[PDB]
C-alpha cells in the first residue's frame, strides 16, 4: 500500500542521522543481513530511498509502521507535553492478579465497540511499564494516523501518563477503557502538566529525595550584615532542601483575592489576576532569589510547595 510507505518514509525522515542505526536495530523488522547492503555514508535522502525499497520488497503492514512510531517516540519523549491520571478503587476490593493479555483484550474491546475503526498498538517496556499508541476513528471515517495518542501505564499502580494532542474529543472514552481494563472504579485527572516525563514520574512516585541517614581571606574587608546573610542562607537551605531539584519549566497561579492597601478601600469585589512563571530550569531559579537579594528570606509557601503537593496549576480565593 502507498499509505504505509508514506507513513514509514515520514517516520524515518523524522529520525536524526547519527542514531538511525540504533532505531533500525531495535525495530529489527528488516533482516540483519539486509542492513549492511545499505551504506549510511551517503546522503540522507539516498538512504531513505533505499530503505523504502527494501521495506517495500518485503510485506509491510500498518502494525509494524505503528511499532516503528512507538520505538521512535520513546527515544525522544520530550516532543510532547504530558498529563497525569489517577485511578481509585473501593475499600473492600481485593488485590488483583494482573495479566497482560487480559488487559490488552479489554482495552481493545472497549474501544472496538464504542467506536468502529480504531488502531491501537502495544510495546511491553522493561521496568514494568506499557506503551500504547492509539489512532482515532469512527464508524464513518478511517483512522487518522497523523494525530495519535500515547499513554504510558504502570501496571499494579494507580497512575497513567498521557499525551495531550487530540484526546479532548474522546477523553471520557479513554478514561472508561483505562478504568475497566485495569479493574478500577473511578478516575480523575491530576492538575500537573510538564514536558519532562521523567520529572513528572519522580514527583508522582515521590522519589526525588533519596538521601537516608544511616550509620553503616583579605581580612582588611569587613562584612557587616553578616548575621542576616547567614540567616537567609540557613532559611533557604531548610526550605528548599539539599537534594537535586526535579526539572520543571512552568507554573501557573490564578488569583481572586481582594486588594488591601486609601486606595480601593470601598471596593468589595476581588481583583482578578493570572500570573505565570517560565524558566529553563524552574525550582532552581527560585532557590537562588533570596541569597541574591530579590526576595525575602522565607518565600511564600505557594512557591516552595510544588513537588510536595504534586501540584502545578493553582487557584487562590480570599
Amino acid at each position: 500500500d502507498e499509505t504505509v510507505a508514506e507513513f514509514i518514509k515520514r517516520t524515518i525522515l523524522k529520525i536524526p542521522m547519527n542514531e538511525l542505526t540504533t532505531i533500525l536495530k531495535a525495530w529489527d523488522f528488516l533482516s540483519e543481513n539486509q542492513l549492511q547492503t545499505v551504506n549510511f555514508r551517503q546522503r540522507k535522502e539516498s538512504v531513505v530511498q533505499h530503505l523504502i525499497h527494501l521495506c517495500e520488497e518485503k510485506r509491510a503492514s500498518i502494525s509494524d509502521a505503528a511499532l516503528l512510531d512507538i520505538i521512535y517516540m520513546q527515544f525522544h519523549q520530550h516532543q510532547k507535553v504530558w498529563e497525569v491520571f489517577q485511578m481509585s478503587k473501593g475499600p473492600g476490593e481485593d488485590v488483583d492478579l494482573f495479566d497482560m493479555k487480559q488487559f490488552k483484550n479489554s482495552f481493545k474491546k472497549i474501544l472496538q465497540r464504542a467506536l468502529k475503526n480504531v488502531t491501537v498498538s502495544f510495546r511491553e517496556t522493561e521496568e514494568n511499564a506499557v506503551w500504547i499508541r492509539i489512532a482515532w476513528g469512527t464508524q464513518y471515517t478511517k483512522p487518522n494516523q497523523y494525530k495519535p495518542t500515547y499513554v504510558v501505564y504502570y501496571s499494579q499502580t494507580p497512575y497513567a501518563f498521557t499525551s495531550s494532542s487530540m484526546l479532548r474529543r474522546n477523553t471520557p472514552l479513554l478514561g472508561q477503557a483505562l478504568t475497566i481494563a485495569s479493574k478500577h472504579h473511578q478516575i480523575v485527572k491530576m492538575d500537573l502538566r510538564s514536558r519532562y516525563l521523567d520529572s513528572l514520574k519522580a514527583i508522582v512516585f515521590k522519589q526525588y529525595n533519596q538521601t537516608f541517614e544511616t550509620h553503616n581571606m583579605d581580612s582588611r574587608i569587613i562584612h557587616e550584615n553578616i548575621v542576616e546573610k547567614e540567616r537567609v542562607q540557613r532559611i533557604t537551605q531548610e526550605t528548599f532542601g539539599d537534594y537535586p531539584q526535579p526539572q520543571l519549566e512552568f507554573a501557573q497561579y490564578k488569583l481572586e483575592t481582594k486588594f488591601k492597601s486609601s486606595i480601593l478601600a470601598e471596593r468589595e469585589e476581588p481583583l482578578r489576576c493570572l500570573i505565570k512563571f517560565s524558566s529553563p530550569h524552574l525550582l532552581e531559579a527560585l532557590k537562588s532569589l533570596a541569597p541574591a537579594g530579590i526576595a525575602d528570606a522565607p518565600l511564600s509557601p505557594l512557591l516552595t510547595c510544588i513537588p510536595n503537593k504534586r501540584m502545578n496549576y493553582f487557584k487562590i480565593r480570599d
Binding site: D191, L302, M311, F314, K315, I316, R317, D318
Partner: peptide
Amino acid sequence: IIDESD
C-alpha cells in the same frame, strides 16, 4: 485557600 475543586 488553595481551591483544589477544579
